[PDB]
Design an enzyme around this catalytic site. Structure first.
Site, PDB file in Angstrom:
ATOM      1  N   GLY A   1      51.611  25.593  34.160  1.00 49.12           N
ATOM      2  CA  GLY A   1      50.444  25.479  33.314  1.00 49.12           C
ATOM      3  C   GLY A   1      49.136  25.869  33.966  1.00 49.12           C
TER       4      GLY A   1
ATOM      5  N   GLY B   1      48.257  28.811  34.890  1.00 51.92           N
ATOM      6  CA  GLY B   1      47.842  30.095  34.361  1.00 51.92           C
ATOM      7  C   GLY B   1      48.473  31.266  35.083  1.00 51.92           C
ATOM      8  N   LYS B   2      49.652  31.052  35.671  1.00 53.18           N
ATOM      9  CA  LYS B   2      50.329  32.130  36.383  1.00 53.18           C
ATOM     10  C   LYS B   2      50.634  33.295  35.453  1.00 53.18           C
ATOM     11  CE  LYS B   2      53.910  29.935  37.798  1.00 53.18           C
ATOM     12  NZ  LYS B   2      53.695  28.961  36.697  1.00 53.18           N
ATOM     13  N   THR B   3      51.184  33.005  34.272  1.00 56.51           N
ATOM     14  CA  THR B   3      51.577  34.073  33.359  1.00 56.51           C
ATOM     15  C   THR B   3      50.365  34.833  32.837  1.00 56.51           C
ATOM     16  OG1 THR B   3      53.499  32.757  32.709  1.00 56.51           O
ATOM     17  CG2 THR B   3      52.901  34.623  31.309  1.00 56.51           C
ATOM     18  N   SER B   4      49.295  34.124  32.477  1.00 58.06           N
ATOM     19  CA  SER B   4      48.107  34.804  31.972  1.00 58.06           C
ATOM     20  C   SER B   4      47.498  35.707  33.037  1.00 58.06           C
ATOM     21  CB  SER B   4      47.082  33.780  31.492  1.00 58.06           C
ATOM     22  OG  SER B   4      47.573  33.058  30.379  1.00 58.06           O
TER      23      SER B   4
ATOM     24  N   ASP C   1      60.471  33.650  32.441  1.00 54.74           N
ATOM     25  CA  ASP C   1      60.821  32.540  31.567  1.00 54.74           C
ATOM     26  C   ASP C   1      60.962  33.031  30.130  1.00 54.74           C
ATOM     27  OD1 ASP C   1      61.059  29.703  30.673  1.00 54.74           O
ATOM     28  OD2 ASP C   1      59.086  30.117  29.803  1.00 54.74           O
TER      29      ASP C   1
ATOM     30  N   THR D   1      52.926  24.841  28.346  1.00 54.68           N
ATOM     31  CA  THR D   1      53.986  24.881  29.343  1.00 54.68           C
ATOM     32  C   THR D   1      54.276  23.490  29.895  1.00 54.68           C
ATOM     33  OG1 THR D   1      53.168  27.079  29.930  1.00 54.68           O
ATOM     34  CG2 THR D   1      54.840  26.095  31.354  1.00 54.68           C
TER      35      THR D   1
HETATM   36  N1  LIG Z   1      41.321  31.576  32.759  1.00 61.18           N
HETATM   37  C1  LIG Z   1      41.734  30.969  31.623  1.00 61.18           C
HETATM   38  N2  LIG Z   1      40.865  30.660  30.638  1.00 61.18           N
HETATM   39  C2  LIG Z   1      41.257  30.056  29.503  1.00 61.18           C
HETATM   40  N3  LIG Z   1      42.535  29.715  29.259  1.00 61.18           N
HETATM   41  C3  LIG Z   1      43.512  29.966  30.160  1.00 61.18           C
HETATM   42  C4  LIG Z   1      43.155  30.623  31.420  1.00 61.18           C
HETATM   43  N4  LIG Z   1      44.292  30.752  32.120  1.00 61.18           N
HETATM   44  C5  LIG Z   1      45.298  30.224  31.378  1.00 61.18           C
HETATM   45  N5  LIG Z   1      44.827  29.755  30.210  1.00 61.18           N
HETATM   46  C6  LIG Z   1      45.636  29.114  29.145  1.00 61.18           C
HETATM   47  O1  LIG Z   1      46.692  28.323  29.695  1.00 61.18           O
HETATM   48  C7  LIG Z   1      47.835  28.410  28.841  1.00 61.18           C
HETATM   49  C8  LIG Z   1      49.132  28.310  29.629  1.00 61.18           C
HETATM   50  O2  LIG Z   1      49.055  29.093  30.818  1.00 61.18           O
HETATM   51  P1  LIG Z   1      50.318  29.944  31.338  1.00 61.18           P
HETATM   52  O3  LIG Z   1      49.803  31.132  32.105  1.00 61.18           O
HETATM   53  O4  LIG Z   1      51.288  30.140  30.199  1.00 61.18           O
HETATM   54  O5  LIG Z   1      51.019  28.932  32.373  1.00 61.18           O
HETATM   55  P2  LIG Z   1      52.378  29.355  33.122  1.00 61.18           P
HETATM   56  O6  LIG Z   1      51.894  30.071  34.355  1.00 61.18           O
HETATM   57  O7  LIG Z   1      53.082  28.051  33.393  1.00 61.18           O
HETATM   58  O8  LIG Z   1      53.085  30.240  32.127  1.00 61.18           O
HETATM   59  C9  LIG Z   1      47.727  29.738  28.108  1.00 61.18           C
HETATM   60  O9  LIG Z   1      48.053  29.588  26.723  1.00 61.18           O
HETATM   61  C10 LIG Z   1      46.289  30.182  28.281  1.00 61.18           C
HETATM   62  O10 LIG Z   1      45.632  30.289  27.015  1.00 61.18           O
HETATM   63 MG   LIG Z   2      54.912  31.099  32.857  1.00 63.56          MG
END
Ligand SMILES: Nc1ncnc2c1ncn2[C@@H]1O[C@H](COP(=O)(O)OP(=O)(O)O)[C@@H](O)[C@H]1O
Ligand SMILES: [Mg+2]
Ligand SMILES: Nc1ncnc2c1ncn2[C@@H]1O[C@H](COP(=O)(O)OP(=O)(O)O)[C@@H](O)[C@H]1O
Ligand SMILES: [Mg+2]
Length: 558
Positions: free
Chosen positions: A18, A20-23, A45, A474
């Site tokens: 959670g 923000g790795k995927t984003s 995933d 997540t």
């Molecule tokens: N820099 C950011 N600003 C705003 N929202 C963010 C940012 N980074 C991540 N998020 C939010 O966090 C949520 C989950 O992050 P995600 O990257 O899916 O986690 P994981 O790495 O576990 O997959 C996403 O739906 C995204 O909208």
């Molecule tokens: Mg992920």
């Protein structure tokens, strides 16, 4: 962005779920593709919404994205790989062996450890295949193997007959791997080379997350990974807290966490990704990443139910950082103030919360178990007792096995079992509960440290395995995975606690308002499907320490 300067071929990411790795991985892929270099975003995933974000049905095959030129998107499915391992390792022994042996094999081959090892198997498949490295200039992974997996798979060998031979060991899944050991060795070597790998570390700007990522960095450096980068993603804009009480507290906590990064992480090239207002859904939002009255039941109802069903265990379970310790302490304090006996037993020695009131109340006895010491004691006990007759290679492999998270969970559960036994006919509120894998594995290996019988835990009338979730996508998905594992183990989580809910804190700023909307959607999802009895804990603008402000969690002013 320092983590994007002269990147190597493989750019992994890792950190707490959670963060923000995927984003960040998607945004990095977009930015590199715009630069004119072919990329390959390997989402690790199936539950990820990368396909929806890019508007393509990404699958086990490489799917070029028309929207983003030069960008290809793959989607590994670690859980599917684990299920395939089970199918190809258990079918042969199904029926041919007694049901007990088959059940033990399945349990030893199921859980988080097998999923991680299967994910590393897919990573090695993508890390050594000449076709991929000769076609794409940047294979931007999404999740990186834990240091334990790399250490296990880089060992000299002999991990080919550890199936059918549980013993509370998560070393069995190695037998499933059908590839040459040279393949995994080459994958690890290419992973540890700074010229071919850049293992970025994504972490939120909170104390617990920063400590966790510091631990992961230390482990990875011990592996051999020399050059790394740190991405502190989640920094809340300063202008956002200009005229809001909750945003001010959030920003102050973020800044305090930044000013106290662990000493090990100081030298890493640090990055700061602000909390972008617009929700990061679709390519439009990701292109610019790297640049209300909630009415839901509080913890009052949960504590009332626990009080009504007296003389039981209240075991809080969930992923690290959700807030299990604070919630357990608050529950124990509330129960003690109701007059009934309590035996709060936390496992966070750093936090001194509820230490100012242990003696004030004659019934709220507190036990502080140190997880590191318990894990070390268990490691020594099982190294001297078992593996003494094993050859040099077996001893090394067992020692590496003992560093898995499940070994720490088993040690903590053993330490908590004696606390249960000592305290009788009184509430026992805990901080962590072993995952279903650990419980089933301990039950399988029936024949001084003792583990409570699974019969007591399975009984709803003597246990209540609450599940704490951070109220995001997540975190909720992985808490649901934990719940599924517990249900497989036979335990039915009594209720859910959606901790750190900005929605219940009456957000009064734009960014916190959008966050509240997202967490409201997630709370609705949790209530509808995952849990039949849930409680939403509002976020506290003051860090919960001591009873006087721990009781705020249980009985908020709404
Ligand atoms: N820099 C950011 N600003 C705003 N929202 C963010 C940012 N980074 C991540 N998020 C939010 O966090 C949520 C989950 O992050 P995600 O990257 O899916 O986690 P994981 O790495 O576990 O997959 C996403 O739906 C995204 O909208
Ligand atoms: Mg992920
Ligand atoms: N309801 C809450 N409001 C504000 N902060 C919280 C809340 N619950 C937990 N926290 C914060 O989260 C941090 C880590 O939580 P903790 O319970 O230690 O996680 P773990 O379950 O891994 O021990 C704590 O420092 C605490 O201040
Ligand atoms: Mg804890």
């Amino acid at each position: 962005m320092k983590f994007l300067q002269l990147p190597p071929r493989f750019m992994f990411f890792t950190g707490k779920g959670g963060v923000g790795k995927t984003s960040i991985a998607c945004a990095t892929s977009i930015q590199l593709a715009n630069a004119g270099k072919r990329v390959l975003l390997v989402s690790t995933d199936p539950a990820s919404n990368v396909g929806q974000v890019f508007g393509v049905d990404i699958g086990n095959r490489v799917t070029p994205i028309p929207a983003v030129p030069h960008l290809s998107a793959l989607e590994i499915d670690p859980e599917a790989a684990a299920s395939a391992y089970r199918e190809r390792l258990v079918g042969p022994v199904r029926g041919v062996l007694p049901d007990d042996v088959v059940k033990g094999i399945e349990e030893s081959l199921s859980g988080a450890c097998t999923t991680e090892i299967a994910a590393f198997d897919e990573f090695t498949a993508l890390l050594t295949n000449a076709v991929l490295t000769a076609d794409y200039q940047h294979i931007i992974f999404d999740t990186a193997p834990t240091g334990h997996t790399i250490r296990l798979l880089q060992l000299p060998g002999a991990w080919s007959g550890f199936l059918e031979a549980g013993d509370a060991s998560c070393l069995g899944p190695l037998a499933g791997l059908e590839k040459q050991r040279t393949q995994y060795k080459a994958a690890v070597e290419a992973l540890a080379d700074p010229l071919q790998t850049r293992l970025v570390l994504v972490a939120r700007a909170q104390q617990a997350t920063l400590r966790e990522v510091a631990r992961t960095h230390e482990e990875l450096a011990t592996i051999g990974i020399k050059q790394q980068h740190l991405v502190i993603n989640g920094i809340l804009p300063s202008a956002e807290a200009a005229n809001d009480p909750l945003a001010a507290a959030i920003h102050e906590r973020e800044q305090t966490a930044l000013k106290n990064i662990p000493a090990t992480l100081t030298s890493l090239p640090r990055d700061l990704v602000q909390l972008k207002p617009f929700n990061l859904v679709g390519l439009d939002a990701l292109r610019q990443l790297l640049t209300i009255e909630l009415d839901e039941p509080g913890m009052g109802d949960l504590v009332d139910g626990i009080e009504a069903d007296g003389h039981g265990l209240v075991m809080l379970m969930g992923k690290g950082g959700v807030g299990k310790t604070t919630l357990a302490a608050a529950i124990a304090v509330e129960l003690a103030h109701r007059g009934l006996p309590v035996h709060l037993t936390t496992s966070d020695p750093a936090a001194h919360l509820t230490d100012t009131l242990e003696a004030s109340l004659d019934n709220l006895t507190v036990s502080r178990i140190d997880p590191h010491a318990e894990t070390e004691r268990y490691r020594q006990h099982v190294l001297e007792t078992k593996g003494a007759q094993l050859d040099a290679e077996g001893r090394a492999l067992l020692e590496e096995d003992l560093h898995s998270p499940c070994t720490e969970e088993i040690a903590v559960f053993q330490a908590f079992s004696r606390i249960i036994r000592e305290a009788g006919k009184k509430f026992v509120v805990m901080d962590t509960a072993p995952t279903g894998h650990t419980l089933l594995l301990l039950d399988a290996t029936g024949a001084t440290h003792f583990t409570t019988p699974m019969m007591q835990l399975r009984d709803p009338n003597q246990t209540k395995v609450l599940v704490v979730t951070l109220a995001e996508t997540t975190p909720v998905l992985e808490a649901a995975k934990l719940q599924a594992d517990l249900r497989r183990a036979g335990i039915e989580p009594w209720a859910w606690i959606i901790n750190t809910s900005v929605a219940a804190a009456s957000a009064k700023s734009p960014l916190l308002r959008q966050r509240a909307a997202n967490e409201l959607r997630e709370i609705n999802a949790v209530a509808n499907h995952h849990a039949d009895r849930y409680a939403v804990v509002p976020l506290l603008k003051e860090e919960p320490i001591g009873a006087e402000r721990l009781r705020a969690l249980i009985h908020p002013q709404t």
